[PDB]
Design a protein around this ligand. Structure first.
Ligand SMILES: C[C@@H]1CCCN(C(=O)c2ccc3nccnc3c2)C1
Ligand SMILES: C[C@H]1CCCN(C(=O)c2ccc3nccnc3c2)C1
Ligand SMILES: C[C@H]1CCCN(C(=O)c2ccc3nccnc3c2)C1
Ligand SMILES: C[C@H]1CCCN(C(=O)c2ccc3nccnc3c2)C1
Ligand SMILES: C[C@H]1CCCN(C(=O)c2ccc3nccnc3c2)C1
Ligand SMILES: N[C@@H](CCC(=O)O)C(=O)O
Ligand SMILES: N[C@@H](CCC(=O)O)C(=O)O
Lengths: 263, 263
């Protein structure tokens, strides 16, 4: 039938989606800026659709409750028909791939460690062998699931510690984890994706850093409900933008060009 | 109908597929070893199929002739029904995605520069601004297409030079490009994927090196003919092997564990 405005679910996560200067006085998509705001515009252009950006109601990426079997976050919004597409730093994972469709990836990342500068930690193994410095992950996302599921000895040991630590080491948003690192005088380290870690490293007050190699290697993809007719065109659009160098230009624009911690 | 042996197309490209010690006396899949031989076994196991490894007849990755519109290489073998799946360092590209199906990627790479140690080149821009050192790419693959298509000034300048250089700067196989670098006393640099570059850097006589950052960022995928029923299971298998850490273990096994240029 007739063309319809595509509902895009996304998440307020710097620098992917941020509230634009003077947003309270603005309406619709003009309220937002960031890597994924730019990426949504480019995809829409190449695919020939109009769209409305919406911020995911529960502020989550997406996990399936083992009791109720219900998905939350952006994944849930796709699964239950509340959005047509997710354009966000949404990690391609096995359990998600079973229930939604994903484009080829538009950005690579791995789990990484964020420390307050000077903290004597260089690796996951270092974290796992000490008790002076607490550490945790985001709730309802792929990093927490990575630890929950890992059979790798070091990561399994870390999960056994994290899942039972009191007070809780988990946070609801990336911003909360970053704030916890910054205020904890070296006594909290945060496990988060390299992309977000490297962004924060270039933001004032320039008091955090990424340490060690990444723990894994994966990608973010644009997601649609399983079988959605939008999927094929969106996937080709990602590959076209990749090949044109536009994704590289956007990463540079939002990570480094406006970095606040020097050249 | 009844289960049938899956024909796998692949390419003799170290360390993805190599001839095993004493192969002349061996038969079938036992003739071969390497990253993709191991990966094929793992995928077959998870997907529940028997398979026969075959080396692509024309020794090419795959390009579409602009005159005849016919695809060659592994892509052609899928497109014309000569193989059921390609398990190889086959780059996911837009023009390929239009004609075959790809899994999510199993390995990341970017175009990179290989030099003979001591060659005074640090970047693509360096290459583009000098005439002492020739440089080229592999035929019938994604690297040559990258330059042919690029609108980025430096890469367009490099293509204008390469496409008309005499004698030809292009090679038929990666091994030929590597040999050309090694024998040319610094006067030839080779543009090839970071994965192959980093492998060769750890092989005797340890006379080459990767210089500069990568020129782009992309992935290899497992390919099937468009619409093949095998695609869904194979894609989940890649994600499962990724998440289990098996792909990382295999990269380490074939690149670094048996590296010949020190620890
Ligand atoms: C199993 C794979 C290991 C390698 C990384 N990966 C990816 O899915 C991946 C690979 C390459 C990419 N290039 C550009 C943007 N996103 C990318 C994501 C997972
Ligand atoms: C073993 C470590 C426990 C945590 C504290 N340590 C640090 O190095 C450390 C690291 C960062 C800091 N930032 C502000 C104030 N104090 C700090 C102390 C030692
Ligand atoms: C060194 C570890 C060996 C295994 C048993 N351990 C723990 O349960 C343990 C206890 C408290 C911690 N607090 C912060 C970070 N990690 C911790 C690990 C300590
Ligand atoms: C400007 C360069 C042109 C090419 C030669 N140059 C080199 O540094 C160079 C680099 C590597 C070599 N390997 C063996 C023998 N000679 C070599 C000379 C200078
Ligand atoms: C410095 C370049 C400016 C533009 C015009 N140039 C060429 O066509 C040019 C000619 C010969 C070359 N031989 C090896 C490598 N690159 C070359 C580039 C030289
Ligand atoms: N990108 C992650 C969220 C961040 C994290 O888990 O560290 C996801 O899609 O679940
Ligand atoms: N991986 C490339 C071949 C190597 C190259 O072009 O450098 C392809 O799939 O075409």
């Amino acid at each position: 039938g007739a063309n319809k405005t595509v509902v895009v679910t996304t998440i307020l996560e710097s620098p992917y989606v941020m509230m634009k200067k003077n947003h309270e006085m603005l309406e619709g998509n003009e309220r937002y800026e960031g890597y994924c705001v730019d990426l949504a515009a480019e995809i829409a252009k190449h695919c020939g659709f109009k769209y409305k950006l919406t911020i995911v109601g529960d502020g989550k990426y997406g996990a399936r409750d083992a009791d109720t079997k219900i998905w939350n976050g952006m994944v849930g919004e796709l699964v239950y028909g509340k959005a047509d597409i997710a354009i966000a730093p949404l990690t391609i994972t096995y359990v998600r791939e079973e229930v939604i469709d994903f484009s080829k990836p538009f950005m690579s990342l791995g789990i990484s460690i964020m420390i307050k500068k000077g903290t004597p930690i260089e690796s996951a193994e270092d974290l796992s062998k000490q008790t002076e410095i607490a550490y945790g992950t985001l709730d309802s996302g792929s990093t927490k699931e990575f630890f929950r599921r890992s059979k790798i000895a070091v990561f399994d040991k870390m999960w056994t510690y994290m899942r039972s630590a009191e007070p809780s080491v988990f946070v609801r948003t990336t911003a909360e984890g970053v704030a916890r690192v910054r205020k904890s005088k070296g006594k909290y380290a945060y496990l988060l994706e390299s992309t977000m870690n490297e962004y924060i490293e270039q933001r004032k007050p320039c008091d955090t850093m990424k340490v060690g190699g990444n723990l894994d290697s994966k990608g973010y993809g644009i997601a649609t409900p399983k079988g959605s007719s939008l999927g094929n065109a969106v996937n080709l659009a990602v590959l076209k933008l990749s090949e044109q160098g536009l994704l590289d230009k956007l990463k540079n624009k939002w990570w480094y060009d406006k970095g606040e911690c020097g050249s």
